[PDB]
Amino acid sequence: SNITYVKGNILKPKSYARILIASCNCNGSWGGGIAYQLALRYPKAEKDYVEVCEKYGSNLLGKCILLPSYENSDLLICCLFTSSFGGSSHGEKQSILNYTKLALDKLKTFREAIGDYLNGHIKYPIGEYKLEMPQINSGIFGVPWKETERVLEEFSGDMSFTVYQL
Ligand SMILES: Nc1ncnc2c1ncn2[C@@H]1O[C@H](COP(=O)(O)OP(=O)(O)OC[C@H]2O[C@@H](O)[C@H](O)[C@@H]2O)[C@@H](O)[C@H]1O
DSSP states (O other), X not given: OOEEEEESOTTSOOSSOEEEEEEEESSSOOOSHHHHXXXXXXXXXXXHHHHHHHHXXXXXXXXXXXXXXXXXXXXEEEEEEEESSOGGGOOOHHHHHHHHHHHHHHHHHHHHOOOGGGTTTOOSOGGXXXXXXXXXXXXXXXXXXXXHHHHHHTTTTTOOEEEEEX
């Protein structure tokens, strides 16, 4: 309903401004999967993510932070902090799903009005960015996509997402 599915790689450039939403661990490790791709392409955004993880660590769970990509003023990154650790040590499915909802709720709040690193780098009003994501939680975090999709659909009327499927 509020989700629009598209086929392809989310990192292929888009002419419109957007926020790339990615589910993250709190341990400062963009180590694998799509996070690693973000670390290679946007290393200054990675440095911000590591800095926040080092300052607050696992107390970030259920929050999100918005980061400039730095390389493209039409691209921001939204980290959803949904697991203390990445890889095999990631959290249990229900924990990740609850943190995914709470973090998406901070994003919705911020768009209606998390943004410390956007100072001086935000090109447009934060509401003008389209919300896009891969199938978050369904790779390294092991959560069936249908269960995340329901979480997304709870924000019907408040937020719309474009979800990329390879
Ligand atoms: N450019 C890409 N474009 C579109 N979809 C992609 C892309 N890369 C991966 N995907 C899809 O998105 C799914 C989720 O990617 P993951 O990186 O495995 O993310 P997630 O399941 O949310 O686990 C997050 C964990 O892994 C790291 O990304 C992060 O550090 C965190 O610890 C993958 O299974 C994959 O199918």
